[PDB]
Scaffold this active site. Structure first.
Site, mmCIF file in Angstrom:
data_model
loop_
_atom_site.group_PDB
_atom_site.id
_atom_site.type_symbol
_atom_site.label_atom_id
_atom_site.label_comp_id
_atom_site.label_asym_id
_atom_site.label_seq_id
_atom_site.Cartn_x
_atom_site.Cartn_y
_atom_site.Cartn_z
ATOM 1 N N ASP B 66 0.824 -1.214 0.000
ATOM 2 C CA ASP B 66 0.000 0.000 0.000
ATOM 3 C C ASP B 66 0.853 1.257 0.000
ATOM 4 O O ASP B 66 0.535 2.225 -0.687
ATOM 5 C CB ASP B 66 -0.927 0.064 1.216
ATOM 6 C CG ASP B 66 -2.095 -0.878 1.109
ATOM 7 O OD1 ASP B 66 -2.828 -0.801 0.096
ATOM 8 O OD2 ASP B 66 -2.288 -1.683 2.049
ATOM 9 N N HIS B 100 -5.393 2.704 3.996
ATOM 10 C CA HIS B 100 -5.261 1.253 4.089
ATOM 11 C C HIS B 100 -3.996 0.914 4.880
ATOM 12 O O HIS B 100 -4.049 0.210 5.884
ATOM 13 C CB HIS B 100 -5.186 0.628 2.686
ATOM 14 C CG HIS B 100 -6.455 0.749 1.899
ATOM 15 N ND1 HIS B 100 -6.568 0.314 0.596
ATOM 16 C CD2 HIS B 100 -7.668 1.245 2.236
ATOM 17 C CE1 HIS B 100 -7.796 0.538 0.164
ATOM 18 N NE2 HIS B 100 -8.485 1.102 1.140
ATOM 19 N N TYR B 104 -3.106 -0.796 9.176
ATOM 20 C CA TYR B 104 -2.342 -1.900 9.743
ATOM 21 C C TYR B 104 -1.605 -1.502 11.017
ATOM 22 O O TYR B 104 -1.514 -2.300 11.946
ATOM 23 C CB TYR B 104 -1.386 -2.476 8.696
ATOM 24 C CG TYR B 104 -2.131 -3.097 7.531
ATOM 25 C CD1 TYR B 104 -3.018 -4.155 7.737
ATOM 26 C CD2 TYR B 104 -1.986 -2.605 6.231
ATOM 27 C CE1 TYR B 104 -3.745 -4.709 6.682
ATOM 28 C CE2 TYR B 104 -2.710 -3.154 5.165
ATOM 29 C CZ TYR B 104 -3.588 -4.206 5.401
ATOM 30 O OH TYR B 104 -4.306 -4.766 4.364
ATOM 31 N N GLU B 191 -10.472 -1.986 -2.683
ATOM 32 C CA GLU B 191 -9.616 -2.733 -3.582
ATOM 33 C C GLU B 191 -10.348 -3.273 -4.811
ATOM 34 O O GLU B 191 -9.807 -3.252 -5.912
ATOM 35 C CB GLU B 191 -8.966 -3.890 -2.828
ATOM 36 C CG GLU B 191 -7.629 -4.284 -3.396
ATOM 37 C CD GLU B 191 -6.573 -3.245 -3.088
ATOM 38 O OE1 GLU B 191 -6.148 -3.171 -1.907
ATOM 39 O OE2 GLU B 191 -6.189 -2.489 -4.014
ATOM 40 N N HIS B 194 -10.885 -0.443 -7.214
ATOM 41 C CA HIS B 194 -9.601 -0.025 -7.772
ATOM 42 C C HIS B 194 -9.171 -0.887 -8.976
ATOM 43 O O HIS B 194 -8.799 -0.353 -10.025
ATOM 44 C CB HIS B 194 -8.513 -0.081 -6.694
ATOM 45 C CG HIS B 194 -8.703 0.901 -5.579
ATOM 46 N ND1 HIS B 194 -7.846 0.974 -4.499
ATOM 47 C CD2 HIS B 194 -9.636 1.863 -5.384
ATOM 48 C CE1 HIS B 194 -8.243 1.940 -3.690
ATOM 49 N NE2 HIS B 194 -9.328 2.494 -4.203
#
EC number: 1.17.4.1
Lengths: 286, 285
Positions: B66, B100, B104, B191, B194
């Site tokens: 990412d 994104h 994490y 995603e 995309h």
């Protein structure tokens, strides 16, 4: 060594996380603003006032389109921390939202012919082309600190200046929802200039005194060039209105804010930057 | 102004799909803060030291991709836009890639230990497979091959990425880490659009090329997919080694490789016999 995974638990400058939190938290879209409630207000504006408003907004649209396309993106290559890069990608995105917002307003209040003519006007207006040209030339250049100086002038000076009109109308009880949307843009703009101006200041500390001096002089010359071109832009747009002198004073007021966002001292004296309290009240700017 | 940059006009869309995607992606805006990750803390300790480490490494690898997509991918596709609205759409995509990735670190902050997290980062900085896939895709983003960049990004999003989402989605079916599963779902909701959108733009560009060039690219696609596939296989055999799910993953890799080809307008490369995945897993996605 390529790119490393970004670690947000390894912040290198607390400023990065603060701005990222402020910018993301302040997310908005034009669809969230009740623009349709300004339709009646719009009807009470003269034909001259409607044209003026449309041209002014198309002008702002050009500026944010550039900031979305070339401005914000040209700074991402000069970021000194991975977190800055993420923030700059948020700024770039919001500049697209800002540019998109004007079309929202045009769709809701104006007529197609009227808007198309305004876009044609913006393509040929001298002062508007020159200001776009000047800034864009710094954005494609090779000097990072000059890109940041141009960016702050675009955000804290060129943009804010166009906000006078919606703020004036709002003080009269007209286009209040459009004014609300503009305050959403300003809430972002104030942070953009502050942030990019801050990163500029840090880069300055890493330079010789001879170099800081060269940039300071550069900053002032660019400002006078943009400022005087903005006066000409203003005198032509508001030729009628009777508001030219109020807008000029607003220009000086914001030029001082642009300068301080860069770490410099105010340049225009209070007698040149006296903004009507009604405009300041209805504003909520930097 | 002049012939330079012109003010964008959203009331003069040049391709309806630009507006569709813009509305869908902006409508789906979100931040990791909007997810009660903390409610997963209890279930997290029900995992062995091996599972936890595995999970953290998978997420670190994904964080690397990412970061790339945010700073190099999405941004390099910019110069290739064919409408002003597509450029604004790509800037949204680039921004969400940062969200994104940032997500994490949120997960680690909410469920892990500093020493333990810095362990995965050092690992990614040297893990042969990971550094190689990153090297491959990144090489294209830097070049001036517009269509190859689009093929690469579609592979990075519809294949390379989903390949890691398997684990989190399993826990969802089981019952563990249900909030993280909600988060991953949000990343997947992005995603999927995309790959679809960029694959869409890729196909528009193809129609404009000569018949021989389309075949050339079509072949190049398979050659890039396989190189990343085998590099992905080596990545899977390593991390999921212990656990004993490598097979589950190898089967997942193929499933998403076919879907990535479809986004580019191509036919499935792996027969259903190889790209099969547990219905429970798929039911969570």
């Amino acid at each position: 060594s390529r790119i490393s995974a970004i670690n947000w638990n390894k912040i290198q400058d607390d400023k990065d996380l603060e701005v990222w939190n402020r910018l993301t938290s302040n997310f908005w879209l034009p669809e969230k603003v009740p623009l349709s409630n300004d339709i009646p207000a719009w009807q009470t504006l003269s034909a001259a006032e409607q044209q003026l408003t449309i041209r002014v907004f198309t002008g702002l649209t050009l500026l944010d389109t550039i900031q979305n396309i070339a401005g914000a993106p040209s700074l991402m290559a000069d970021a000194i921390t991975p977190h800055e890069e993420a923030v700059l990608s948020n700024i770039s995105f919001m500049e697209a939202v800002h540019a998109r917002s004007y079309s929202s307003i045009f769709s809701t209040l104006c007529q197609t012919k009227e808007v198309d003519a305004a876009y044609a006007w913006s393509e040929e207006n001298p002062p508007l082309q020159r200001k776009a040209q000047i800034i864009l030339a710094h954005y494609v250049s090779d000097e990072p600190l000059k890109k940041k100086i141009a960016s702050v002038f675009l955000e804290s000076f060129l943009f804010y200046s166009g906000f006078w009109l919606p703020m004036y109308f709002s003080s009269r009880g007209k286009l209040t929802n459009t004014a609300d949307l503009i305050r959403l843009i300003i809430r972002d703009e104030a942070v953009h200039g502050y942030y990019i101006g801050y990163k500029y200041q840090i880069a300055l500390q890493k330079l010789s005194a001879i170099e800081r001096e060269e940039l300071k002089l550069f900053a002032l010359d660019l400002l006078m060039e943009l400022y005087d071109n903005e006066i000409r832009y203003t005198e032509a747009l508001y030729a009628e209105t009777g508001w030219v002198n109020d807008v000029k004073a607003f220009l000086c007021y914001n030029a001082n804010k642009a300068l301080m966002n860069l770490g410099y001292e105010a340049l225009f004296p209070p007698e040149m930057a006296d903004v009507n309290p009604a405009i300041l009240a209805a504003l909520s700017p930097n």
